[PDB]
Amino acid sequence: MDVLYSLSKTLKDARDKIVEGTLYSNVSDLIQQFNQMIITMNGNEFQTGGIGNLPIRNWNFDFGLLGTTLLNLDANYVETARNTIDYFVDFVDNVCMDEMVRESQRNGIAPQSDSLRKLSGIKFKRINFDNSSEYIENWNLQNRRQRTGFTFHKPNIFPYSASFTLNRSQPAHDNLMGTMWLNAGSEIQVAGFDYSCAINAPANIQQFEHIVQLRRVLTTATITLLPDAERFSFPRVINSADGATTWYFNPVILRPNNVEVEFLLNGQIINTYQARFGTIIARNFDTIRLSFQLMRPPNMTPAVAALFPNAQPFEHHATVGLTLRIESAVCESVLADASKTMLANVTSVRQEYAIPVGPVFPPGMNWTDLITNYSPSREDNLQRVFTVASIRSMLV
Amino acid sequence: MDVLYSLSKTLKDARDKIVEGTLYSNVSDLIQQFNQMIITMNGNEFQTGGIGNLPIRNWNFDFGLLGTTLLNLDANYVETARNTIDYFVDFVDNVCMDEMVRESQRNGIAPQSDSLRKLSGIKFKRINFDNSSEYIENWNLQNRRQRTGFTFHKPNIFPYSASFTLNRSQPAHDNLMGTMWLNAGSEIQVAGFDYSCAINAPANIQQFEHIVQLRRVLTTATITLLPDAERFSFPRVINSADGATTWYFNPVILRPNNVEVEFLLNGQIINTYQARFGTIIARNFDTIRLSFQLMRPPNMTPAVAALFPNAQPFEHHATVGLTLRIESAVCESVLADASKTMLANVTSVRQEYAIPVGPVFPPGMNWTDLITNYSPSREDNLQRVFTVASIRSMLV
Amino acid sequence: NLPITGSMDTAYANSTQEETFLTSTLCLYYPTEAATEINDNSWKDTLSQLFLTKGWPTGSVYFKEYTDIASFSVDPQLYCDYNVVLMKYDATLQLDMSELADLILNEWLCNPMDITLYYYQQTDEANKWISMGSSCTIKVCPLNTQTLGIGCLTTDTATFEEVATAEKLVITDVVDGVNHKLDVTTATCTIRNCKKLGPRENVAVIQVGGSDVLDITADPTTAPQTERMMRINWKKWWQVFYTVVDYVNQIIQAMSKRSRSLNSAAFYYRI
Amino acid sequence: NLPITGSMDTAYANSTQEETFLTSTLCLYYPTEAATEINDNSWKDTLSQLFLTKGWPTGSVYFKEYTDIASFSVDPQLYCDYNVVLMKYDATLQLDMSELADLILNEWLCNPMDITLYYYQQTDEANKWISMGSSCTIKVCPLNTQTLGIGCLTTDTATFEEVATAEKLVITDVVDGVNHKLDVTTATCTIRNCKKLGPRENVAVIQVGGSDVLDITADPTTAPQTERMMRINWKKWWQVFYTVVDYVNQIIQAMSKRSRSLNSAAFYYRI
Ligand SMILES: *[C@@H]1O[C@H](CO)[C@@H](O)[C@H](O)[C@H]1NC(C)=O
Ligand SMILES: *[C@@H]1O[C@H](CO)[C@@H](O)[C@H](O)[C@H]1NC(C)=O
Ligand SMILES: [Ca+2]
Ligand SMILES: [Ca+2]
Ligand SMILES: [Ca+2]
Ligand SMILES: [Ca+2]
Ligand SMILES: [Ca+2]
Ligand SMILES: [Ca+2]
Ligand SMILES: [Ca+2]
Ligand SMILES: [Ca+2]
Ligand SMILES: [Cl-]
Ligand SMILES: [Cl-]
Ligand SMILES: [Zn+2]
Ligand SMILES: [Zn+2]
Ligand SMILES: [Zn+2]
């Protein structure tokens, strides 16, 4: 991986810096590294592909070195460099694609393609140079068994789930108490509803709770909390739990009461915010506990008093919502997020070449299944393929 | 692991071979290896950690070389060697214990304790010599991504499960048809029971099927198959599936008819055995399908015909059994088995020092839970700890 | 009762209308004047066959007759899994019909009221006094802390406050938190202290003619018309029964299974 | 009917007897002579109170009276969730007792028979002909493969073979696979072609006095005597009822819920 990344970085620097008219002083070290790469790769045969519809390709390296006596680069030097750069870039892209489409259960972190396994030999470490990208940096930290870290803007940590729970229910579904939620990506919209508006509640208060378990620990997370769940603030007909029938939800929104968002790590309360909305910080957590209350308004105007009668029928159903959005976070494991494209790259490469479903990832690289059962083996394979995808993105 | 194994092997060889009066020609290579170990270890400081109640221990190595120039080993030589060997054996045992009690979700195949991580450095590679044990051989094969093989006598492959399935049932539980089984270790006992004795069956034949999906592929397996299942051939009072009530079982054993044992790999029939009892060979399989039949005897003596009336009540219930014992097998993964002691050693070491439950293994190293969810991370950690346990057992 | 967790992505199941029609019974309650006007001894069989055309198995639809609203209100016994009451409208009985609805469109937990030995009070808005019989004349005398009476003398029933006279059914609501001496004709009336638990889903009331006058809630601020309170204009009873038969699926859709666990003694007509 | 998979370690639930009594009902069937000897106008009330001491809520236990075994045999309707039939033993009515026990202790699937038009045969051992009514007289004429009577004349009903005379209930079991012409007093009794599905687990029969003579299976080689067929000795009916009440726990233990789905809507009690 380090050798493949170094090949890609050398090629990218060659593309960027070997330009017409530039002082040789601007590329001397780069030209030395490039010639070292040529020397190391010369006489080596590689084979990529042979999986799915990815074609089998044979790579031979017999290249001359670049000149070193120029003061300023000219057209001839640039074209001579560019021929070799094109061949090497094609080789690196094919190696990256071959590695992105393979997976193993026991040793998924290790290289899978024969080309990368061959490149993992000692003699190729001469190619190795600056490893500055975030993903290669984390790869090297992981290989050294140091603490790793990935910054995610809107991390896709919550698998898609639009569900509900009815703590009070009847077959006719006319006096319902419960809570409905959507967890999607970095978003958690929850809404606790009481059809009776907590008229019979002990203190005219109904307590609603929502616990969301994150499959990985998030640190240095910035979250925005808002007091309404727009997703569950309009009337809708919702299937029954068994699917036998459907019920009617007719929300009327009241502000949530005694809002308390707790961020927990291993069952211990790390962060706690009561009646706090806007931007909050969760420094380290793996579980979120949103506990809110529906409080019956003790004083009501005639219209509000008309909304909520003493007994059934209950035509307007009191609802209190919370919205939680993780805008940024840091995770020791790789995750899909809104800003990056590694998941998209891996899925695109797997789809374009009709890679058969492997024993590790879910079919079609579907993210909800992947994050629902994010096992250590899946984490290893995902880190490998994401690092390969970033390396490929340097060039392609 | 190879360095730790080589330390243990050198110490075991020294203890076995460095004996009073023995020719030096019997130990020359052993003495050379022992002196190499002393030179490599001299001047190095080691620490076995304080995980759980395991004491923190510090090890310093400053030992003179074992002497040459003796035709036959005398008592002074053996005494000096015994002092050095005792200290080294204590160090190796403590390192093995420290490694046996640690685990990681990811990279669980790598060393966990600081002592073994230090031993994994290049400078200690000199200590490495003959790796002949089955576990170290398979460890080296796994390191190189080669085919691995562990031979087990009575492999612990089936998690404990005493369950039943009622294909025909009703609240009174007086006319039941179904199967009850115990899958434990290398043994499967199954029994298909019909209370009506197939009086109303299409051809007076009731078909029973039992599918056991092994969580690891077994190869070169010798299996004893016996007609009757003694575990389900006596009267029982069995709880209902939901535990609401208890039903009565009153077996009368008829011989199983049209017995069909299929050993399947990836849903493909690898081995088939029809009406065969005694020793059979399943060369490569991961699923077992036992299809047997209860055939109503066309001719019944007056005593027999009294047990099987035309209609209810059915006081005697016709049962056909099957026993299947895996006497020995080969698996690419590490498993508990009757003969070896790796699981017992690891569990004993963890229990003795009150090691807190980690994130990899079930509490108490429970084998049923371990093998029910035998995940790749669990396989890596289990192979690591079992190899360390086998290394320790060479000396302790 | 346990929490029920459901996914909003679950697929809708097929129509269960045919299965519930096959495995449930329908009771139709009509006034005797309906049978009089129809003037046919086989109309039960004809309606059963028409319901069979609608899907109900033969014999699942039970036809029950009552003389009038007043007589029907004396301890009505609803048997089938689904009950439909064709209630004739009378401008003079607006309360009575309402009371009848309030008794059959809601679940009631009732206990005896031996007024000769005890003075009773209504603890909350759900508590009412349901009196049923041939003739229910209920007089009320609110009492004070010394249990003597306000604007009434406990001994003199004449001075009592009249809340019902010559009634087959009456639901009495007095001011809560006050003890009352009750004088009822126990010979021809039984009074019960009752709490309304909630709607009774398996009973629908179709008002034949008139306007919306039903008020199944004692609260003056609410007069809610649930889906189980239908109202049809009419001139012939055959048309009424034909529209009941044709829209039977709609009527049952507005109704649900009773879902209540009872402790009382009533027969049922079930399949 | 899906397979049920269970583990042999599932923890037992607590006793459901209390909730079962609170949510089920018991119908006790006794002869008229029982009430005649008891000679009390409220023995039902005291029996219900004793049952309440035993657990059953008031109004849950129902008491049904029948004149005698013969009269009770004419289309017996069993209402409650649990039914206990106290059948007195008469040494001269053993077959009638057996027929009643066979009818009410087993589940039957019956269809009508037109003895006037078509010939009939019994397919298998589970197939019988149950005829009940005010008076059942059944004569049978077995036919040969040319639909000609054997030892009987199709045209002449006098040559028929008599299998029932003036019976109120009779189960006819003829040779299977042979077509028979049936002469039945259809004007006073109905014959139905029935198949025995299985046992009725909610009906227990307590034989008062006598010996074990019941035979609910036509097979000569079986006299089952299931756990739902009890027998007691008696001199007074009050002792019999006290024994029934005291050991109602065991009696219900011997019975299970019906568990059969019926396509016919009948009258039942269900709490
Ligand atoms: C539901 O309806 C569909 C469409 O007619 C049919 O294919 C299916 O078998 C029905 N039953 C179920 C259980 O889905
Ligand atoms: C069941 O019985 C046990 C022991 O008598 C008692 O503690 C428990 O509350 C009962 N109920 C349940 C639901 O376990
Ligand atoms: Ca009235
Ligand atoms: Ca007055
Ligand atoms: Ca009141
Ligand atoms: Ca009102
Ligand atoms: Ca008879
Ligand atoms: Ca004759
Ligand atoms: Ca027969
Ligand atoms: Ca018999
Ligand atoms: Cl954004
Ligand atoms: Cl053995
Ligand atoms: Zn629901
Ligand atoms: Zn052995
Ligand atoms: Zn069961």
From Swiss-Prot, chains A, B:
One of its GO terms (cellular component) is viral intermediate capsid. One of its GO terms (biological process) is fusion of virus membrane with host plasma membrane. It comes from the Viruses. The N-terminus is blocked. Ca(2+) binds at N266, D286. Zn(2+) binds at H153. One of its GO terms (molecular function) is structural molecule activity. The VP6 trimer contains a zinc ion located at the center of the molecule. The zinc ion is not essential for either trimerization or transcription activity of the DLP. Zinc-depleted VP6 has an increased sensitivity to proteases. This is Intermediate capsid protein VP6. It comes from Rotavirus A (strain RVA/Monkey/United States/RRV/1975/G3P5B[3]) (RV-A).
Curated annotation (Swiss-Prot), chains C, D:
GO terms for biological process: receptor-mediated virion attachment to host cell. One of its GO terms (cellular component) is host cell endoplasmic reticulum lumen. Disulfide bonds join C27-C80, C110-C194, C136-C189, C141-C152. Some rotavirus strains are neuraminidase-sensitive and require sialic acid to attach to the cell surface. Some rotavirus strains are integrin-dependent. Some rotavirus strains depend on ganglioside for their entry into the host cell. Hsp70 also seems to be involved in the entry of some strains. In group A rotaviruses, VP7 defines the G serotype. Glycans are attached at N14. N-glycosylated. The N-terminus is blocked possibly by pyroglutamic acid. Residues 182-184 are annotated as: LVD motif. Its main location: virion. Residues 198-200 are annotated as: GPR motif. Ca(2+) 2 binds at Q122, D173, V174, D176, D246. This is Outer capsid glycoprotein VP7. It is found in: Virion; Host endoplasmic reticulum lumen. The lineage of its organism: Viruses, Riboviria, Orthornavirae, Duplornaviricota, Resentoviricetes. Calcium-binding protein that interacts with rotavirus cell receptors once the initial attachment by VP4 has been achieved. Rotavirus attachment and entry into the host cell probably involves multiple sequential contacts between the outer capsid proteins VP4 and VP7, and the cell receptors. Following entry into the host cell, low intracellular or intravesicular Ca(2+) concentration probably causes the calcium-stabilized VP7 trimers to dissociate from the virion. This step is probably necessary for the membrane-disrupting entry step and the release of VP4, which is locked onto the virion by VP7. It comes from the Viruses. Keywords: Calcium, Capsid protein, Disulfide bond, Glycoprotein, Host endoplasmic reticulum, Host-virus interaction, Metal-binding, Outer capsid protein, Signal, T=13 icosahedral capsid protein, Virion. Belongs to the rotavirus VP7 family. The chain holds residues 56 to 326 of 326 of the full protein. Residues 110-112 are annotated as: CNP motif. Ca(2+) 1 binds at D40, G151, T159, E161. One of its GO terms (molecular function) is metal ion binding. Homotrimer; disulfide-linked. 2 Ca(2+) ions bound at each subunit interface in the trimer hold the trimer together. Interacts with the intermediate capsid protein VP6. Interacts with the outer capsid protein VP5*. Interacts with host integrin heterodimer ITGAV/ITGB3.
